[PDB]
Design a protein around this nucleic acid. Sequence first.
RNA 1: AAUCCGGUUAAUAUUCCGGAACCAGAAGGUGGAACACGGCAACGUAAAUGAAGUUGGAGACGUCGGCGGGAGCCCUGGGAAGAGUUCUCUUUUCUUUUUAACAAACCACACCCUGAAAUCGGUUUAUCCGGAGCUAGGGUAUGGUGUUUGGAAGAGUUCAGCGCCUCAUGCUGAAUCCGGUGCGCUCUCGACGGCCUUGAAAAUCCAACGGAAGUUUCACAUCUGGUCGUACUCAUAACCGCAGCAGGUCUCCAAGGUGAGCCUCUAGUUGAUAGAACAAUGUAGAUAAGGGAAGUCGGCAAAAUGGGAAUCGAUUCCCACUGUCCCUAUCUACUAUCUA
Lengths: 124, 70, 98, 49
Amino acid sequence: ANLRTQKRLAASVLKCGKRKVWMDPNEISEISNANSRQNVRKLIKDGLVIRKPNLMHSRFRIRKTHAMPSAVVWMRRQRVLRRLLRKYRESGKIDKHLYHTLYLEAKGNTFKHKRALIEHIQRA
Amino acid sequence: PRQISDIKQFLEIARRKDATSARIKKNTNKDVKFKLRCSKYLYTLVVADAKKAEKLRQSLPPDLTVTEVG
Amino acid sequence: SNKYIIDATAAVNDKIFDVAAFEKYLIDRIKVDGKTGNLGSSVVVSREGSSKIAVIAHIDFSGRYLKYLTKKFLKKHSLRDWLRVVSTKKGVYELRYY
Amino acid sequence: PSHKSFRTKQKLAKAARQNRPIPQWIRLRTGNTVHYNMKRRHWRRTKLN
RNA sequence: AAUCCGGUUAAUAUUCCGGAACCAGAAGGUGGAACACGGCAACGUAAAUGAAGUUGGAGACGUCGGCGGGAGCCCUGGGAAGAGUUCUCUUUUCUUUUUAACAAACCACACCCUGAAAUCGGUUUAUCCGGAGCUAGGGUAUGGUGUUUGGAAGAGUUCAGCGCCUCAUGCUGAAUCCGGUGCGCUCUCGACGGCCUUGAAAAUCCAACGGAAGUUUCACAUCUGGUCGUACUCAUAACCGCAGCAGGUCUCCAAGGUGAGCCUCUAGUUGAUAGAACAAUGUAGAUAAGGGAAGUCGGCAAAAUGGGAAUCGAUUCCCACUGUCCCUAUCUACUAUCUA
């Protein structure tokens, strides 16, 4: 017969889309008689109406095909130099008087890598 | 909902006339949760020992309605 | 450490595949670290009785891998449409009809 | 809209009752020219204004 | 001033149901409270009188930029369940893997105490602080925060099995776990740096000064919260255009890949009278041998990818390109043709 309302209710109780709602083709009479949501849930339990599973976006080939700001480099580099230079104070390698000068140079981008700052500590 | 840790106070809330029902919950870590429904707050008590779980159950006044695992 | 058991009572009753055949298939197709039969001492496969295949592994062992290995034999035997693999309990697998 | 006032709703209420079909028994009375409705409106057609 | 989650209907949901909270007003009873104390201090507490009068704050507010945090989405590993693949290799491929309002405790920009600095120290991503007190140590407070729990697994979800003429639609087992990652998208917050045009009103609430009169501003419990709107569309069909009109309309949420476009996931449509045959013509496109503006008032339009030099964007020149032309031919779709 006509099953617009049954499909709408089936999507409502399955919490899915009516495109994914699958309604059995050779039990039309019983499905048509099932008119209320209680009857629709009965059909769900008996398996007459099944929710089709989702499709896929195939990350498989997405991974297969898988396999710069000028400020951000200083953004992290300045952090590492300061965060290392701070622990050297607590470790006692450099006193506050020399650290003031060393931190002042570090602003001027005198070294480009953390090992470069380490050679200055070795020199001093 | 308040979490109550002192056993005696949970007894005295239970003895209070405002208390209406209590719920006993058995968790997977063998903790039992005494959930006492009051007017404003739901007072819960987690006691780790199974036997303190039991001597608490009948020390609750009989008039209060205890309920099994909710 | 972990124990993985695949019951074969239904297969034995239906005479689909014997426990000896299941053990031989497991030995010949155990892709442990990419090598067949390389289970060694970390993983030991000891089928107790002719109704199940049990493996005690001290390293990681995937139940999905065991199910996939079992399903591989089903495809060869052309009995996939007759039986499907299910997990009765954690670390436990079984074959049930449709 | 879904924010109508009471007076708007009441005016709508009787406008919905006005455009109803006429009972047959009043037609079946004698000397009663009433045999159809000449005040039948439709929402898609002429607005209530 | 104050509400969230799950479920329910053929049609209503922050409104109904079950559960868990909040706000406002109103009186009392019980217990504790006594014109109170402890901390040098940044303060704190269950209480800690305040008649009148006086006073302030919140409410009560522009714009840009960077930084860090959080939430959700996206990416991703291990594990678990289901589905796909298989002689071969693939511990594979795909789908799912959730925690609301509301509470409790704990838990760092501003301030203070000790301290008295230069040898100038601390210190922002973006050089500011300091003799108006530095570093350091110890506290103080706003504590979305998460650190656990309640809510709360009893919910929801994914599985497997059973119950049986049957409105039997209930019953039983599990799992719903452990992480990583960010110049990613959206929302939002805080210390800052700018642009200065320094940026509404009230109720209500709060606070202070104040000084008449010899157990609440505490906890629990109790009662009440009137009125109107609530369905549906928000449009290539529910509004406006005379109309089921190719038009016009305010606004929120917005996945992935390849790399602005194309393909998809979720979701939603398959809507617009249709069938047969490719006549002339027309429309929309493309290709064309040799020549290369010889066409036209003229490089209109395409191809060179449009460009080289001169004169005053225009003009000219040389080179370059091409169906404008010699000279038209061919191919496709639609219409026209026939039919209901």
